[PDB]
Amino acid sequence: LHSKRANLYYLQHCRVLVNGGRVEYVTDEGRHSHYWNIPIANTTSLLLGTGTSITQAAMRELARAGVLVGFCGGGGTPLFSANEVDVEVSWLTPQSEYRPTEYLQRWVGFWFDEEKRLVAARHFQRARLERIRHSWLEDRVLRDAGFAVDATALAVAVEDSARALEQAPNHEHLLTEEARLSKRLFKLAAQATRYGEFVRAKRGSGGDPANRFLDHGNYLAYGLAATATWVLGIPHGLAVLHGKTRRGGLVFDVADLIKDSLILPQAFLSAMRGDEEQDFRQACLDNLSRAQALDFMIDTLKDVAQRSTVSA
Amino acid sequence: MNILLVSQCEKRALSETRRILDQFAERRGERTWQTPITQAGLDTLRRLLKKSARRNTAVACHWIRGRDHSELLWIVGDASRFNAQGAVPTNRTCRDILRKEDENDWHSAEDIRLLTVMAALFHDIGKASQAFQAKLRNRGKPMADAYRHEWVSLRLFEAFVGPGSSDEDWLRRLADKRETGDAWLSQLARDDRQSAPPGPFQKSRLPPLAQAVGWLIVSHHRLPNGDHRGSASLARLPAPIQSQWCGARDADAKEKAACWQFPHGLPFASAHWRARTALCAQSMLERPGLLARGPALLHDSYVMHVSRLILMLADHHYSSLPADSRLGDPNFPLHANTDRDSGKLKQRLDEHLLGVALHSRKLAGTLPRLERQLPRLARHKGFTRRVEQPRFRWQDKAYDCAMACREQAMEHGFFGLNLASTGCGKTLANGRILYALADPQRGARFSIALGLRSLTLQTGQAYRERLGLGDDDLAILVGGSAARELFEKQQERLERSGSESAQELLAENSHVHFAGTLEDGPLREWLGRNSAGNRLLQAPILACTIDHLMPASESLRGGHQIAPLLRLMTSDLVLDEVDDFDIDDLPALSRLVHWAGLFGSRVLLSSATLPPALVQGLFEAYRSGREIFQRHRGAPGRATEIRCAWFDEFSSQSSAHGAVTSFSEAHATFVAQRLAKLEQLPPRRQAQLCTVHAAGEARPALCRELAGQMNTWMADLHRCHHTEHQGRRISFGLLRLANIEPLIELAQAILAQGAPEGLHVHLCVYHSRHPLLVRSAIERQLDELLKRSDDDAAALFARPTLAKALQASTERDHLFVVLASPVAEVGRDHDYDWAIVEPSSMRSIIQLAGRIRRHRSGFSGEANLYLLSRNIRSLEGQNPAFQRPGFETPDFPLDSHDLHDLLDPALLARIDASPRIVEPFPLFPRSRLVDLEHRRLRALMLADDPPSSLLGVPLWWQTPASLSGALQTSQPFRAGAKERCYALLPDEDDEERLHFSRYEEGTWSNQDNLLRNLDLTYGPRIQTWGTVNYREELVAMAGREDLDLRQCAMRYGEVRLRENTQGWSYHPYLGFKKYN
Amino acid sequence: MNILLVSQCEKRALSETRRILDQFAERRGERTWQTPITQAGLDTLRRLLKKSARRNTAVACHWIRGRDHSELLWIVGDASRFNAQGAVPTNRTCRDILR
């Protein structure tokens, strides 16, 4: 169960089939695998990972019960394909088991008001600058990891960014402040890791291990955010901070919440230890799971809409 | 036009095609060509490639018709190297990767499992009552319990659930293991009180699933059967069930009070019982959407009846197993049943419930595997070999049509007909057609049922010979069905111990003659290692009588419907000579056909005199059954289009139908075509009306006069027809009659009178009152000695018995006669030079007519089939006359019994099935025999005014009438005077002493007082032929069967008779003759 | 436009070209593909084939321009297998025969 709120399960090394009107999993560990304790009801969703297959009859039964289905990648990220969630309105009232969502209405209810979009961007930036502190300071596991974070410089940069963010009149100023904070955090981590001078090459052209690690962590985080928006039911195009033209804006906006706080340390740690790709991927997944990122992304996304409707 | 040609040949074929093609196109690849060619070039290329092609040739031509479009023109040679579009596979392999055996399509297996398991855990709970325990411990005289234990169990369950509550309420309550307490027994509405409380099945008393479980709980020993029969309340079933329906015997108030007492609590105390019940309730709660299915499940016959079958089988198996201390509380005081021998307590109640539930759970997952693991007949060359005789080509045509229609029949159903006229050997046609339908990879299974009361062994072996199947592939179910009341007395005696589930599935008399594999039975565990049931189930092909399968739906008590029902589910069905049934037994046949269609079988009637009304009714019943089945099997949503077919010796057709009207239209068209084709044949028989002369109605003198006239008829008709060889003339006769007593009286009279001048007569009495082994021997001899052909005078005269008879004779003319009974109508492939037929019904007249000159062509144009103007019953002044057998009834009287007026004179010159297979318009029921029969069939089968019943057959599937045994009583099967089984048994210590003993409840009691000897007198130039030595025949049969002589006489020497106070008289040549 | 592709590849190159071409067309034979396609997709096909080609690769593409007329578009790898028009030799022999 990736998230307690979402009620989302992950399946691997298993064949899903039906025997006498009931969906059955066949996997090593026989009739003791804990896949038999998965409530099949309106309040469940299934994600199938590595080494898995699903029969047509099984998905007929799942549709009869009202369970969404999706095919994810190794470990839970990225998302390849899945079902779609319908909207809930006074009209458009079909008879089906699937439970519809309501957040698209509330989201669209303010996305057309520029100032409300500004408020939302402020909330996103505030969440990111908040989580950066916890990740970079409180983590005892990270402290034992080896990369040494100087409290003074990080506090100075976080306070400066907070002051700058509170005083951004238009979107472009907010983007400039974001870039400044990102560059400063990059520099601080580079100094902490002793890696030396580092940059964020365009096109992913950077040949240094740090570049590859950063790209891979980015890819994983984007996958996770895609899962988040799909679970909630909002579309990808309806960006909040990015420009209205840039496709997939909302995925990157939500992904940024955890990227600079989770991916950044791990890439430098791996480069210092000079580990291979598989171990780095496993480490990133483990850290994401422990930090319980997906829950935080979902909670923030609901909170924005709640505040927008309350202030209405 | 420009085209693309690709080759996929191999070996030498490759070089040839390369040579042929390289003349027309430039080589674009090792196996590809492409060039612009004209149409003529393409046609000649196709011709050339066709001419020299081999087995390994596969060439495809594609046309680039225009823009973004190209089509496949043709494929020369093997078509398995390409698909429809002309693509080719990329890879190949043998290891299965689809692995499609893991997933089955029993879409309701889980619901059945849950309902059964819950029903099992509660079914025998009523055995905790103090009265039951006292009876268990009581050794003295037994008193029948005032209430059946199943009714007590139902009342306890109703009290627990709590009236008026929704399902979730009691489900949750039961599932909560912590909850315990006897505070819910205050609602036990006892039925001993002065005011009778409302029935548990009423609308306000139980929720749907509660009633579904309760029905299985209460109906696990016998179906409910009250006295009400109003169709209005039938459609409201199971509501009107009340304590009386379930055999609530009348007793005194003390016993009634004593039944409703539970001094020792309930099984709820046991920890294992409670845990298992909680688990089952939790599972039944978690299943998606089961709660909202309650009402639909309650009124569904397939689910409820499969569940009841499973429960009955599991209960029967476990009740026989010995005690086991591993299950339940080791020190629980209550018990379920004793031992049958030692009369001591054997099992604990909770242990018994737990064991039955476990077994039901185990079995419910085995049924889906039965079709896959059971034996089958496959790769049988006899059914595949072509036939060279031109008379047997229509069989090949029908066999080809079977393949033509096989695919869609596997998915939608099947309902076949077979109208080939007699003498065409329909048996082989039926075998081949049914085999063709089955998938060649796996094999075939089916069963053949005859409309005969008793099936003699020689008939089964004849079936083997005609099919050409070894003794290792065809089981035979000898004997006939048993009586209902015989099992009662032992059951009441066995009810002392409460082991009513231990009764044998089949009767003791029946034996299955089979010697094939018997060790790898998937159901071996429950049915018994060598009981008759397992042998019946193993055999790929079965031959039996319809009376042996009818218990599938007509059974009212015990578990007699388990084996035939399993047979129906796992195989297919063939009905033979259905119209041989009496009119009032057709409801039962309709119910059997409906259930056969309800469980996935495929029916195929077979006869040559099927009136339209019968066929229409049966098709409607089969379709009604098939519709329900498709809900619970196969891909959901597909339509209901049965795959009908018609088959005879002229042509063949097949079409898909889904409504009664379209089927009726197509059938009418086919029968009209058949009549048109049939009319052109040349006749082989010329009937005639003969006027009997009667002075007095006394049976003896009447028989004397009849024999006197018959002798003259014999002389004249033998003069007319005869076969000569070296100056000697012989002939084969047939004297059919209606009833056995007049038959034997006529036989005695003719024996006394003697043959006419210049003629010698051989007589061979043959009816159904002989001992079964003797009858089989007689039938064997007759079948051997009555095969005819063309220009076979020398061959026939070369036969041993004929040569012996003739050698010791001084006359020049001899007469051989078969004074048969109606038994000669069915299954006898004989041939007679002539016949004299007593009139009872049109079917009899046609069927007997088909015998004459069955195998010998040509015809002298002389009359060779007399007919009595009036039947014997008329001569005795009996009204109605055409009855037993016959159709005349008080509701359908006939003005004049004389045959001169009841039969069209045109039909005399040509007698066939034309008058029967079509319904004339207008109908004249008071003048014409066929009119009367068609009227009765139309009235009963399909019309809504069935005589004397007013209960339309469609009630069986228009109302939930199968939940209660009501229809089985208002329209019984083979009803009438009860019959008893007798036998000639040698004395235990003196084999030379034969005793006339009656069959008592599992013991034979001597009844030598009832028997008496009768003497015979003979005349001139008269002798018998075809007779049998009873003692020698019995010894021979025992020797062949490697059995004790007494046991063999017990098994095979059975004979049935109607009760008579004064007994009978016996003679080895006449059988049993009633005495007064 | 509809095209016809013939593969003369050899040894390892055979598996690679079979892998690449199978994404775009159905197989009409052991070494033949044929389906309609647009110019952009065809250019992508050619580029992908060129990128990972080996010494043994040999692929040819024909275009059915219209009625009773066809053209050869390109060849990737060794052009020794095909002649100028795109046909293929029926047999080979090391023994000199021309003399």
Place this chain on the structure above:
DNA sequence: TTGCGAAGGTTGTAGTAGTCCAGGAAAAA
């Protein structure tokens, strides 16, 4: 009673070309 696809090794077959020897043909309207 127990996933899924890839890589390496082993086993079997069809298909290609070289060698040498022998015969040298086509049947209307």
Place this chain on the structure above:
DNA sequence: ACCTGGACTACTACAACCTTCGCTTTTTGG
């Protein structure tokens, strides 16, 4: 010192079947 067909003889390319074994994918303009 002519020119094809056939039978016979090597002798390689293909293809599938049997064992282990890791489980990613560049991921960039978003």
